[PDB]
Every structure is written in structure tokens, then in C-alpha cells.
């Protein structure tokens, strides 16, 4: 998986990332003389602790093979350290939804939720807990294809047990996925806008929930609500979510 | 000291045409350290000695400064045609960056840019340097979380009333212009006084009118802008204070 620097041509900055900017580029590879790729960069990679955390993402990504999870291509482990990944040419999901707010139909939004559920059901099948499911970590490969893209605390996305006791489980992932579904159906608006992070848990405990997005099918909002059961053992698993989302999507396409 | 031989520079693509010269990207191969990406500003052959001198002055001015949010001078080529060699900010001009990436740039990024520019301007104020053209058009983007003041040398829509009325420029008039620059940032690169005639701006200022609060701009940040636009220059804050206040506003946004 080590790639010689000389085989990479660093191109335009596509977006921000957790450890540094993400660029598009070309990988002049033996299998392909001009492969379009994404290049994740890392500021402060001269620090051993930062470099270790950055590259741990690559190792994680390498364990998975799913159509809706971004694939690792390689790494450059000399300074400046780079991760080379599959390029998703339409970029970050939040910006895509905001820009295309009045161009994207409901069926497309439901499709993106369904596709992410397939990825998350696969991760569940491997007993992998993600801990940071949110629209900001989803990438858009085509107008009909999104991928999970990324493997201080995102309080506004977190299950109550995660906020209170730092417990992250398959059940807390479902809570977060509910918030991600809300975000999609809101065309990339963040949850709890105008609320301080410290006040979020109090509202959740008081039984308050994100409201039904405009134009959201009632069946879909109901599914969101199930993801936000206070008691984690009452939340659905991803097999159920995937199945229900498939039905909802087909219903919507029959419109 | 800062002279470089033209052979050490490989001129690349033009990234900005201009009246008396153009801006290019390129590569600098230093005898000590190969190899460096750079920005090259070129003076046209037909440019007057007077305007040529301004090019050299820009480099001379830039070389006096050492700050993380001010573009660095690498060197100059004094033999005609004059080229000025500077640090390369790869994401380019701030206005274009704000307009194009509007929907990828959340409020914390916009506040960060204002804060970073305030640190650059506090540093210039510490050197008793008066800039005279603070505007988003003169800011470059080095990374998605790093902007730099990039240029040191008719912008009536940005100018303090004393600068319009009297051609007086001081540290206080810089603060006025910085307020306008903040407004531009929070407006994702919209110019101030769009569709308004230069000759009408002063009439509106003296009448008490000011640019309106941008959508999603925190009221505390707009209050800062409004302080920058005190008609009396002696009532404007200095950049040390603006920097401190912007740090507070940035922290408050991060708590959300």
C-alpha cells in the first residue's frame, strides 16, 4: 500500500479534513497511468502522535469492502504524510445538499439514506462501531451514489449515553444515523442550530427531539424517532432500517 | 540580500492578469534548498519607471514583515523586466474562494478568517505600519483554515470618511477598512455598496448609514464592525482589542 511520492501529482484542494486539507490528484500507477484520486493531508504529521492517529484511519479503511464505503488506494508515510483514496467527485454531502437543494427530489434524499444504511448494516455485520455518523462524513460519488467517507465532540449528533458516560455502541451509532437522516431530509442543515452544545443533553432528557423536516414522509420521520429511543435497547438495528428505507424509497418512486 | 537570478526561477501559468503587470505561479530552485513552489508578480516592459518603482517598493515593504498571516517575500529580480518572488497561497484570492465555496464555509471558518487577519493587522500596527487598502481582494488563502494578507499596494467603498474627504490614512482608517473587510467575509465575498456610485458613498456615511448586518452574523460580531465604523477616528478600537474580541467570538461559536 506504500506509494512513491513521485507517482502522485497533487492537484486542487477539494475540501477541509480532520487532520488537514483534502486535495484531488493523479496517481500515475502501473495499473492505470492517470488514476484520479483524493489525497488526504496532515498538518503536524511531524508529530508522532498526530501521524499515528491520521494513519490509523487508513488501516481501518483497508478492513472494509463495500460499495458505499470509500476505498483506500495507498499511503505515503514519509513527511508530508498522505492518504490516497478513491475520489468522490461531487464532494462533501452537506455542501452538495445545500447547493442542490431545489434540484434534488425526495427520492434522491431517501436513496442517500438507504445507501448509508447499507454501509452501516455491513459495518454492524463486522461488529464495527463507527462513533461519528453525520452528514459531514459522507461523500458524493454521483448524483445517485453516496459513500461513508471518514473513519470538539459532535455533541449534537450523540446518543444520550455517549454524552453522559462516553459509551459508544452499535445502538449509539443508530441514534447518530437518525440525526444523519434528519440532516439529509433537511438538505444539509445542522441539528439544534442556535443551541449551545451544553444545553443539548438537557433537552434530550426532557424528551425533546428534532422535528419532522418539511416534506419528509411520515413513515421516514417515524423511523428517525425509533432511532432516538432514549433506551438504547429499544432502538432498531441496521438490518431493519435498511429494509424499511428500501420500502420507503420504493413507495416514493411509485409516486 | 533578496536578489535572485532569473535562471533559478521557472515561470509557470498566469493566475492573474493586471494593468501594469501580471501574476504567475512558478518554481524556485534555491542553491541551499530545492525545490519551492512560488508566486511571481511580473512588471510589463512598457511600464513606467514610476510604476516599476512601486513593484520594488512592494517587495521592500513585504521583506520588513515576519508573521504567519502575512505573505512572505522570497526575493526579487531587479534586472528588467522586474519579477517579485513571493510565498505561494495555493487556494488563491479570498473573494473567489468565499463565493465558490460559499456552501462549504460555515460561520466558524468565516470568524477564523477575520481573527487571523486581525492578528496580521495587530502585528502591522505594532510596527506602526499603515496599510491603506484592507479589503478581501487583498487577502489570499493558504489553506482552508489559513488566510494571509497578500498585497501592500480609488477603493472608496472601503475607505474611512477622513480618507475620502482628505486622503488622510492612519492606523484608525485601517480599522475602518478592516470592518468593511469583515463584512465582506461574513457576506461570502459580496462587495460592499453593490450597484452604488462611488460619489454617493460619503453622502451615506455622513448621514449615519452603514452596511447592514450580514445574515447569520452574530450580533456581537456586527457590533464590532459598527465600532470600526465610528465616524470619529479617535473612537475606533485598535487591532489588539479587535483581536481579543474576535478570539472570544470565535470561541463562543466553537461552543456550538
Of residues A146, A115, A64, the one with CA closest to residue A242: A115
Q: How was this structure determined?
A: X-ray
What is the dihedral sign for C-alpha A115, A41, A99, B145?
positive
B106 is catalytic: no
CA distance A25 to chain B (A): 14
Of residues A233, A113, A90, A229, the one with CA closest to residue A180: A113
**How many CB atoms lie under 10 A from the CB of residue B122?**
18
Q: Are A3 and A74 in contact (CB under 8 A)?
A: yes
Q: Are A128 and A69 in contact (CB under 8 A)?
A: no
Q: Are A159 and A232 in contact (CB under 8 A)?
A: yes
CA distance A126 to chain B (A): 33
Residue A179 CB partners (closer than 8 Å, separation 6+): A133, A134, A156, A157, A191, A210, A227
Four-way CATH pick for A1-87: 1.25.40.10, 3.30.200.20, 3.40.1580.10, 2.40.50.140: 3.30.200.20
Radius of gyration of chain A (CA): 19
Q: Are A187 and A101 in contact (CB under 8 A)?
A: yes
Which three three-digit cell numbers place residue B163? 480618507
Which three three-digit cell numbers place residue B159? 475607505
Choose the catalytic residue: B133, B145, B200, B232: B133
Closest residue in B to A101 (Cα) is: B103
Give the Cα separation of A191 and A172 in Å (integer): 16
Phi, psi of B142 (to 5 degrees): -95, -30
Terminal Cα-to-Cα distance of chain A (whole angstroms): 47
Give the Cα separation of A2 and A75 in Å (integer): 5
Four-way CATH pick for B1-88: 3.40.190.290, 3.30.70.930, 3.30.200.20, 1.20.1250.20: 3.30.200.20
What is the dihedral sign for C-alpha A175, A177, A180, A181?
negative
Same fold, B1-88 and B89-256: no
Give the Cα separation of B235 and A3 in Å (integer): 58
Give the Cα separation of B99 and A18 in Å (integer): 23
Give the Cα separation of B127 and B70 in Å (integer): 13
**How many CB atoms lie under 10 A from the CB of residue A34?**
9
Give the Cα separation of A94 and A117 in Å (integer): 17
Of residues A121, A111, A151, A118, the one with CA closest to residue A134: A151
A64 is in an annotated binding site: no
Least CB–CB distance from B103: residue in A13, A20, A98: A98
Phi, psi of A82 (to 5 degrees): -130, 145
Give the Cα separation of A246 and A118 in Å (integer): 10
Helix (H/G/I), strand (E/B), else coil: B115? helix
Radius of gyration of chain B (CA): 19
A20 CB near a chain B CB, below 8 Å? yes
Domain ranges of chain B: 1-88, 89-256
Q: Does domain A88-255 have CATH number 1.10.510.10?
A: yes
Of residues B62, B157, B149, B89, the one with CA closest to residue B113: B149
> Mutual orientation of helices A170-185 and A218-227 as an angle, nearest 10°?
150
CA distances from residue B242 to A6, A83, B145, B220, B239 in whole angstroms, order as listed? 45, 39, 19, 12, 5
Least CB–CB distance from B103: residue in A16, A95, A194: A95
Residue B28 CB partners (closer than 8 Å, separation 6+): B4, B8, B9, B10, B35, B36, B37, B38, B74, B75, B85
What number of residues does chain B have? Answer: 256
Alpha helix stretches (DSSP H) within chain B: 49-63, 94-100, 107-126, 161-166, 171-186, 198-206, 219-228, 239-254
Give the Cα separation of B204 and B227 in Å (integer): 17
Of residues A131, A153, A149, the one with CA closest to residue A40: A149
Resolution (A): 1.8
Three-state SS letters, chain A = CECCHHHEEEEEEEECCCCCCEEEEEECCCCCCCEEEEEEECCCCCCHHHHHHHHHHHHHHHCCCCCCECCEEEEECCCCCEEEEECCCCCEHHHHHHHCCCCCCHHHHHHHHHHHHHHHHHHHHCCCCCCCCCHHHEEEEECCEEEECCCCCCHHHCCHHHHHHCCCCHHHHHHHHHHHHHHHHCCCCCCCCCCCHHHHHHHHHCCCCCCCCCCCCHHHHHHHHHHCCCCHHHCCCHHHHHHHHHHHHHHHHCC
What number of residues does chain A have? Answer: 255
Helix (H/G/I), strand (E/B), else coil: B80? coil
Exposure b/e, B153-188, CB count within 10 A at least 16 = b? eebebbbbbbbbeeeebebbbbbbbbbbbbbbbbbb
B256 CB near a chain A CB, below 8 Å? yes
Q: Are A75 and A84 in contact (CB under 8 A)?
A: yes
Residue A206 Cα to chain centre, angstroms:
28
The answer to whether the CB atoms of B143 and A196 lie below 8 A apart is: no
Least CB–CB distance from A16: residue in B103, B144, B255: B144
Q: Which CATH architecture has domain B89-256?
A: Orthogonal Bundle (1.10)
Angle at B108 between CA B117 and CA B178, to 5 degrees: 25
Amino acid at each position: 500500500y506504500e506509494i512513491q511520492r513521485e507517482r502522485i501529482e497533487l492537484g486542487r484542494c477539494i475540501g477541509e479534513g480532520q487532520f488537514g486539507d483534502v486535495h484531488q490528484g493523479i496517481y500515475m500507477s502501473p495499473e492505470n497511468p492517470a488514476m484520479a484520486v483524493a489525497i488526504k493531508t496532515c498538518k503536524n504529521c511531524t508529530s508522532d502522535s498526530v501521524r499515528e492517529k491520521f494513519l490509523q484511519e487508513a488501516l481501518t479503511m483497508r478492513q472494509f469492502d463495500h460499495p458505499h464505503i470509500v476505498k483506500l488506494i495507498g499511503v505515503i508515510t514519509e513527511n508530508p504524510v498522505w492518504i490516497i483514496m478513491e475520489l468522490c467527485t461531487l464532494g462533501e454531502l452537506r455542501s452538495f445538499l445545500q447547493v442542490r437543494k431545489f434540484s434534488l427530489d425526495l427520492a434522491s434524499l431517501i436513496l442517500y439514506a438507504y445507501q448509508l444504511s447499507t454501509a452501516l448494516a455491513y459495518l454492524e455485520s463486522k461488529r464495527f462501531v463507527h462513533r461519528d455518523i453525520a452528514a459531514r462524513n459522507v461523500l458524493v460519488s454521483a448524483t445517485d451514489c453516496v459513500k461513508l467517507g471518514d473513519f470538539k465532540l459532535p455533541i449534537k449528533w450523540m446518543a444520550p449515553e455517549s454524552i453522559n458516560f462516553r459509551r459508544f455502541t452499535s445502538a449509539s451509532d443508530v441514534w447518530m444515523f437518525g440525526v444523519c437522516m434528519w440532516e439529509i431530509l433537511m438538505h444539509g442543515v445542522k441539528p439544534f442550530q442556535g443551541v449551545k452544545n451544553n444545553d443539548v443533553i438537557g433537552r434530550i432528557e426532557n424528551g425533546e427531539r428534532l422535528p419532522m423536516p418539511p416534506n419528509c414522509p411520515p413513515t421516514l420521520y417515524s423511523l428517525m424517532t425509533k432511532c432516538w429511543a432514549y433506551d438504547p435497547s429499544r432502538r432498531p438495528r441496521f438490518t431493519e432500517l435498511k429494509a424499511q428505507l428500501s420500502t420507503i424509497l420504493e413507495e416514493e418512486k411509485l409516486q
